[PDB]
Amino acid sequence: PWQIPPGLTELLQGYTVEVLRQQPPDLVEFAVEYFTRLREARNKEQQNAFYEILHLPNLNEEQRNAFIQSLKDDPSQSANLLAEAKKLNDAQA
Amino acid sequence: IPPGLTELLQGYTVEVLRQQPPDLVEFAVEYFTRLREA
């Protein structure tokens, strides 16, 4: 459509706040820097979830699959899914 | 607010609305890199 992306404000907000802290001399160069590192952090954070869930010992095969399936489909809630998979795992001990 | 920050973030914002990329962060790396190259 032509909509306003959810999270656009928060995402722009955080770049600005970090601009404050370091006062980079070139806003463009820092943006390339900020968002690259913000990307890498997310890839890093997602990779890790996948595995942990991978070998969580008290999950049956069907649960591990559901969580991993949700994880591959939606990186943004990797923290949400890792939490839910650990809660359901701890209870299943 | 440092000078230029508003115009810079506005520019990115218009293109986000123009193009509706599926990931804002990934597009950000895309958008600002092209801007740096120019």
Author numbering:
A (entry chain B): 2 to 94
B (entry chain A): 5 to 42
What does the paper say about this structure?
Here, we propose a method for generating proteins and protein complexes with complicated shapes using fusions of alpha helices. To design amino acid sequences that can stabilize the alpha helical structure of the fusion sites, we superimposed one or two turns of terminal alpha helices of connecting proteins using a molecular graphics program. Then, the amino acid residues important for forming a fused helical structure were chosen from the two natural sequences in the superimposed region. Our method does not require complicated computer calculations for the design process and can be used for the assembly of artificial protein complexes with predictable and rigid structures.
As a control, we produced a fusion protein of PKA_RIIα and protein A by the end-to-end fusion of the connecting helices. The resulting protein was readily produced in E. coli and could be crystallized. The crystal structure shows that the PKA_RIIα-protein A (end-to-end) fusion protein shows substantial structural variation at the fusion site. Asymmetric unit of the crystal has four fusion proteins. Structure of one of them is disordered at the fusion site and the protein A domain is not visible in the electron density map. The remaining three fusion proteins in the crystal show substantial structural variation at the fusion sites and their protein A domains could not be superimposed. The PKA_RIIα-protein A(end-to-end) fusion could be crystallized but the connecting helices in the crystal have substantial structural variation at the fusion sites. Therefore, overall structure of the fusion protein cannot be predicted with high confidence. We and others have demonstrated that the simple end-to-end ligation of helices does not create a single continuous helix, and therefore, the structures of the resulting fusion proteins cannot be predicted with high accuracy.
